[PDB]
Design a protein around this ligand. Structure first.
Ligand code: NAG
Ligand code: NAG
Ligand code: NAG
Ligand code: NAG
Ligand code: NAG
Ligand code: NAG
Ligand code: NAG
Ligand code: NAG
Ligand code: NAG
Ligand code: NAG
Ligand code: NAG
Ligand code: NAG
Ligand code: NAG
Ligand code: NAG
Ligand code: NAG
Ligand code: NAG
Ligand code: NAG
Ligand code: NAG
Ligand code: NAG
Ligand code: NAG
Ligand code: NAG
Lengths: 937, 196, 49, 49, 49
């Protein structure tokens, strides 16, 4: 919108707090504008908080509005570039008054060079791309900017006064330098970039994005009267009777406490505001704005010396101001407000009314809340200017009349995102009924983004909704059984689930049209069970405070905290110790010395160790740690597992140690705790020849096909290998068990980053060194600075200890599940239906995992049913005591066919019934008479 | 065709991936197959009456059960599941469990709301009012009296949410091993399904 | 607020982490509820089911 | 391997010189959560645990 | 146990202007206060010996 405004080189001026290297960060402060009009396109005047200039291929004056003899301003000076570069002063051509700084700071004029200053809430920064200069000044406030320009610039010279705050996101490269940025108020997509600190955010649903609302402040509610004025200001209270005056519910003026004197008040005046009559006070603001608590008001009138009175000593929460010099003698009036807990606030300008139907946040009788406010019509009690039904705040009176408050419904949108141009806004609250959107309560609340479909989720805008069709790939599920798809234009669909098909066949009698499956398929159901975490040995004496001794004689006052923490970490550590020991006591099994060879099962090149196997090494390669850190160094040392060195990190009091048998160092089926790949399927009585005869005997056992030849086993073999070589082609998403190990890794990494940010950050204390706090502050105010961060490192450490404890309690009962899963599904063959896997169970291997164990349950879900007829058995004669027959290890079957046949219990390969597959018994139940004699001897 | 996912001052509650108490059990998309438990994985069985007669043959009460034994078990069934209406909260032992879950959840959110209503000894709950009234440094010790208290209320909620998630992780291992072994199959285990 | 030991990033990452544990684990619950009832839908006689 | 405190941040490690001269702000930097590079008196000093 | 080192400032440090003129009172005659930011003070050159 302008001729020459450099946007690429704003990033030379942004700075985070402390050297954050290679990830993003949001930082709030006074920062220059997006607007192409606010830069010039040459004396400039404007109001704001700070300013910023650059120069392409400057005598800047900053002052308050009302200037007196003793104020503070600045002006920066330039003449002709490199010849006379820059002088900076803080004074009033006339060096008449207080001059704080005389600093050159000579800059380099280049093709690109941006700098500026800020003074937002008196945090006066004077920034330059090498260095900043920070100040805070108590009696300072700057509101006026007098920019001036040189006579001629080659391109357009440029200047910007900044009006309000900004909260910009910042990326930063390997050297800590900023190189990309995005203001949060420029658009909509960068609003949620500023929400979750990521710059090019991937598609997905992003929950709980807020809407900033303006505020309203109601310290008093009832309509407010006046007060008696300043007292008589008579002689002293001992020689003659004198009275102080009270102030409870007055609309004060704070300038009728004096005689007008025609502008002759030097001390009460602010450099912008007028007459705060409290020129020095203890424990509270000199600046009086808004409403202050009630006070009784002493007054004195005494003599002085040459225009220079001395403030008296005063109670620690009373407040002093004086006036009335400039009458050709050295007498004056002084006063003391004391602010003693009257509860009736005293202030000018009683509050008018909240405009109804707007969702602005409030504060009424020292209770902030955030809703929309309507009038009401039921007049509750004459106490209680705001009431509560249960826990909610539902009815407030404001200025005599009752105002009912309902919750703001539009404050949270969950944006679901594809790219910049296409997204959809979902409000999880706020239904949109057509009688409600057109309501009179809602005239001032609505936006263009509220004309959406009222869903069961909420209101979704700028997206389609149709639940009649389903989808199965719930990549980013949304809730309530709904899923958002991100293929084309964004939409909301109803997610579904693949069906189950129980393997409990029912016992057959009284012949019926039983359907049997015609063929199965293998299904691998990988199942991660978290089973280890690194055992810890914390030392709270040297975590909560370092080598400083002044902590350690003060730390044992805090309720026996340190002995409880170290005894608890030892106690939970020895629970984990004994319980991982009981886990490996039921892993270490008794495989034979025969070690039966396989023929077509590639099980030795996937599941057996090479010193870890080719599945869990490939599994560790699929896991992405969030960033470099202490857990990143721990995990990436434990990932590649380079021999004959350690990675047990110690940092400032917390020694991590590996547990009694760490899972992700040892291979599963190798080493000392060998897990016996054979001893599951080959049974406790070994001697069975190969995996091929083992699998044929298995398929006979679970009743798919008896006496299975090479064709059925090799078909199951090609199924096995082509479905466990598919352990490489699954990513983190759409996996459901790589999401579990990534959830364990992210939980563990976020825990240690909490545990390190607790020791880095001062918790509002002046530093993190206890000596520096001790050698700087008071005898007692250093105590309240000590117990601000020793009580914060206490909370960070105890938060870690309770996270460690609850995950130990989870792992105790999970190891009961893991033990009952290994030596009942991996080592035996379970009769239980869904315990091993889905349906008919074949084989179940287990491998190691990060912080856990993961099972490979191979199963046989059937897919193609064929409906047949099924008797228990066949008779030829109606007589009790006839020759009757039943099937041997199978079911009798007819495919709507004239005669009966034999088929296994769980699969349909029909055979003519012979002497081999038929047991002759009895007339027990009502078997089916086929009314013809047998064809079998 | 409307929602109730409350949002109040920073905390948006959302329904989970499939909320149990919106969807019916044996209807809808996640249909739970009332038949497929007792009628077995190989269906085609005629009625519930022949299913129950085949069941009583299986667990060995009476073989080849006629209409009298199944109808006696039928009148037993209906007169004992129409007694799902005449049990109150006390003397129930499973309405006490859902009432314990509801009371735990309600007391948790009333803690989570009383943490944002109450000043923790600070002069107000508005940070501007604390800032525009008190000292440069005594307002810091009034700020860090309630920001350090809303911190504790929020973290107390987060650790309650975490421990109930850890409970629900292993409870869902029990619930899965109970549905597809006692509801869908017929368990050989003694006390896992029920008494006897 | 960001002086207090990384409190806020820990809380929102933890609620997201426990939320996605509950997300995947209710998903595995309904993956073993959703079953394969037949299209015959066998009638009852005296069971008011 | 003496413990330090540089710009109001105490830590405890061993300190070596380094040779890569990061930005002119930021007298100590952080890679992720670790405190890895400090400048002390103009020249960059790398700190290992 | 390791010994400690304390670095409140890092960059090399300049001097400051000394104690002011100590002239008459700030109302009858012009008087100025003096700032102190990055000075190697002596704390005994604020007086006459
Ligand atoms: C800057 O602000 C003005 C008024 O707020 C607006 O009209 C103008 O378009 C903005 N400039 C931009 C967005 O570049
Ligand atoms: C401020 O300066 C003017 C200019 O000489 C003078 O007349 C006035 O008395 C001064 N004000 C005070 C309070 O000294
Ligand atoms: C600032 O310093 C320069 C050089 O030291 C000097 O010429 C000038 O008078 C000084 N100005 C003030 C106001 O001290
Ligand atoms: C920052 O990230 C880039 C990209 O991998 C890398 O080359 C660089 O080394 C990183 N910086 C540091 C200090 O590790
Ligand atoms: C509040 O009191 C003032 C002073 O008497 C009066 O002018 C004003 O109208 C009153 N407000 C209402 C709503 O009556
Ligand atoms: C305070 O008193 C002055 C004296 O004239 C008057 O002009 C001003 O309006 C008063 N302010 C209020 C709020 O009444
Ligand atoms: C007031 O002024 C007189 C005359 O200039 C002087 O003698 C006296 O010391 C001054 N008082 C103070 C307290 O400086
Ligand atoms: C989306 O916008 C951002 C910022 O404007 C930009 O960095 C990114 O390249 C854009 N992406 C697409 C696909 O338009
Ligand atoms: C709605 O979607 C259209 C098309 O993608 C887009 O141009 C428009 O900006 C969107 N509006 C809102 C409010 O999301
Ligand atoms: C919402 O959009 C429809 C279709 O354009 C329109 O008929 C209706 O008036 C809109 N509602 C509002 C409140 O603007
Ligand atoms: C879903 O199907 C019903 C019944 O056919 C229909 O009334 C409804 O309009 C459909 N939904 C959408 C979004 O079209
Ligand atoms: C989608 O679902 C199908 C059927 O369950 C599955 O085969 C496939 O891997 C899924 N794909 C993705 C991307 O999740
Ligand atoms: C077996 O007996 C039962 C009950 O008497 C009957 O319902 C069933 O139809 C009989 N079986 C055959 C094949 O007729
Ligand atoms: C059933 O499974 C087998 C084995 O994978 C497969 O060959 C067949 O195509 C499947 N049937 C259908 C209808 O997909
Ligand atoms: C199994 O191993 C053999 C050995 O060479 C190999 O040829 C085959 O491709 C492997 N994979 C299968 C059968 O999926
Ligand atoms: C057997 O007969 C049933 C009768 O309902 C029919 O549905 C089915 O398709 C038939 N199946 C075969 C394999 O003949
Ligand atoms: C089974 O017996 C029938 C006659 O009962 C005969 O036709 C058929 O060839 C036999 N073999 C089969 C189906 O493999
Ligand atoms: C032949 O079978 C029918 C029904 O299957 C039944 O009457 C009896 O078992 C047999 N009848 C005769 C006359 O043999
Ligand atoms: C079961 O349903 C029938 C249908 O009318 C009803 O008559 C009977 O009372 C119900 N209850 C029982 C059998 O307990
Ligand atoms: C720091 O400054 C002083 C004073 O100029 C100088 O003597 C000293 O050598 C400087 N240090 C370095 C490392 O240059
Ligand atoms: C401070 O001044 C005295 C005056 O002689 C001098 O002896 C001493 O060395 C000075 N101290 C420093 C640190 O310069």
């Amino acid at each position: 919108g302008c001729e020459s405004v450099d946007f690429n080189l704003f990033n030379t001026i942004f700075s985070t707090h402390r050297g954050l290297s290679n990830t993003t960060s949001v930082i709030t402060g006074a920062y220059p504008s997006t607007n192409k009009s606010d830069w010039s396109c040459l004396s400039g005047s404007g109001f704001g908080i700070g300013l910023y200039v650059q120069t392409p291929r400057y005598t800047i004056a900053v002052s308050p509005i009302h200037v007196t003899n003793l104020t503070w301003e600045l002006w920066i000076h330039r003449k002709w570039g490199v010849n006379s570069v820059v002088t900076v002063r803080l004074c009033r051509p006339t060096n008449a008054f207080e001059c704080l700084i005389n600093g050159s700071y000579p800059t380099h004029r280049n093709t690109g060079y941006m700098f500026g200053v800020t003074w937002y809430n008196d945090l006066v920064r004077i920034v330059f791309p090498p260095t900043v200069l920070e100040m805070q000044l108590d009696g300072l406030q700057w509101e006026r900017v007098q920019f001036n320009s040189p006579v001629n610039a080659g391109h357009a010279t440029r200047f910007n006064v900044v009006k309000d705050i900004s909260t910009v996101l910042v990326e930063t490269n390997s050297g800590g330098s900023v190189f990309r940025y995005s203001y949060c108020a420029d658009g909509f997509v960068n609003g949620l970039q500023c929400k979750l600190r990521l710059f090019d955010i991937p598609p997905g649903v992003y929950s709980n994005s807020e809407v900033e609302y303006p505020t309203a402040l109601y310290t008093v509610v009832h309509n407010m009267s006046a007060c008696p004025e300043r007292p008589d200001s008579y002689c002293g209270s001992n020689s003659c009777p004198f009275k102080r005056a009270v102030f409870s519910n007055c609309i004060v003026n704070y300038t009728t406490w004096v005689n007008p004197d025609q502008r002759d008040f030097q001390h009460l005046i602010l450099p912008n505001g007028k007459f705060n009559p409290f020129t020095e006070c203890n424990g509270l603001n000199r600046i009086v704005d808004g409403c202050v608590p009630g006070f009784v008001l002493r007054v004195g009138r005494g003599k002085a010396v040459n225009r220079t009175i001395v403030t008296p000593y005063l109670k620690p929460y009373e407040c002093f101001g004086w006036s009335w010099n400039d009458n050709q003698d050295s007498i004056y009036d002084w006063w003391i407000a004391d602010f003693v807990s009257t509860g009736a606030f005293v202030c000018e300008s009683n509050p008018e009314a909240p405009k109804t139907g707007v969702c602005v946040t409030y504060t009424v009788e020292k209770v902030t809340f955030q809703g929309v406010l309507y009038e009401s019509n039921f007049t509750f009690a004459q106490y209680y200017n705001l009431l509560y039904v249960g826990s909610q705040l539902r009815y407030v009176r404001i200025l005599g009349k009752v105002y009912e408050v309902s919750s703001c419904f539009e404050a949270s949108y969950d944006v679901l995102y594809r790219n910049n141009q296409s997204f959809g806004l979902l409000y999880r609250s706020f239904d949109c009924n057509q009688l409600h959107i057109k309501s009179a309560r809602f005239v001032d609340r609505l936006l263009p983004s509220h004309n959406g479909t009222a869903t069961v989720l909420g209101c979704l805008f700028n997206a389609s909704y149709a639940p009649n069709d389903t989808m199965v790939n719930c990549t980013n599920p949304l809730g309530d059984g709904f899923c958002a798809d991100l293929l084309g234009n964004v939409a909301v669909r109803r997610m579904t689930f693949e069906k189950h098909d129980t393997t409990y066949v029912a016992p057959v009698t009284n012949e019926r049209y039983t359907e049997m499956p015609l063929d199965h398929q293998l299904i691998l159901t990988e199942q991660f069970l978290q089973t280890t975490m690194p055992k810890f040995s914390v030392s709270c004496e040297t975590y909560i405070c370092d080598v400083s001794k002044a902590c350690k004689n003060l730390l044992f006052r805090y309720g026996g905290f340190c002995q409880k923490v170290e005894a608890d970490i030892r106690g939970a550590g020895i629970l984990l110790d004994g319980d991982v020991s009981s886990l490996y006591s039921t892993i270490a099994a008794k495989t034979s010395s025969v070690v039966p060879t396989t023929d077509r099962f590639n099980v030795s090149q996937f599941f057996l160790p090479k010193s870890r196997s080719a599945i869990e090494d490939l599994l560790f390669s699929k896991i992405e740690t969030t960033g470099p850190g202490f857990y990143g160094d721990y995990y990436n040392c434990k990932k590649n597992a380079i021999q004959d060195l350690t990675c047990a990190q110690y940092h400032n009091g917390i020694l991590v140690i590996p547990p009694i048998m760490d899972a992700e160092t040892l291979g599963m089926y190798g080493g000392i705790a060998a897990a016996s790949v054979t001893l599951g399927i080959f049974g406790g009585q070994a001697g069975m020849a190969t995996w091929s005869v083992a699998m044929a005997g298995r398929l006979n056992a679970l009743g798919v096909v008896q006496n299975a030849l090479v064709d059925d086993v090799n078909k199951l073999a090609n199924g096995f290998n082509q479905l466990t070589a598919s352990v490489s082609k699954l990513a983190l998403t759409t996996s459901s068990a790589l999401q579990a190990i990534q959830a364990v890794v992210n939980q563990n990494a976020a825990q240690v980053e909490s545990l390190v940010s607790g020791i880095t950050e001062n918790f509002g204390a002046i530093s993190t060194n206890f000596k520096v706090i001790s050698q700087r502050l008071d005898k007692l105010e250093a105590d309240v600075q000590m117990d601000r961060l020793i009580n914060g490192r206490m909370n960070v450490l105890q938060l870690f200890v309770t996270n460690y404890k609850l995950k130990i309690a989870e792992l105790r009962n999970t190891h009961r599940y893991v033990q009952s899963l290994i030596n009942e599904c991996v080592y035996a063959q379970s009769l239980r239906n869904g315990f091993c896997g889905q349906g008919l169970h074949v084989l179940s291997l287990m491998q190691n995992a990060p912080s856990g164990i993961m099972f490979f349950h191979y199963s046989l879900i059937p897919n193609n049913t064929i409906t047949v007829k099924t008797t228990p058995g066949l008779c030829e004669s109606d007589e009790l005591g006839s020759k009757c027959i039943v099937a041997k290890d199978g079911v009798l079957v007819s495919a709507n066919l004239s005669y009966w046949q034999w088929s296994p219990r769980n699969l349909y390969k029909p055979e003519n019934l012979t002497f081999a597959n038929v047991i002759a018994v009895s007339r027990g139940a009502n078997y089916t008479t086929l009314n013809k004699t047998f064809d079998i001897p």
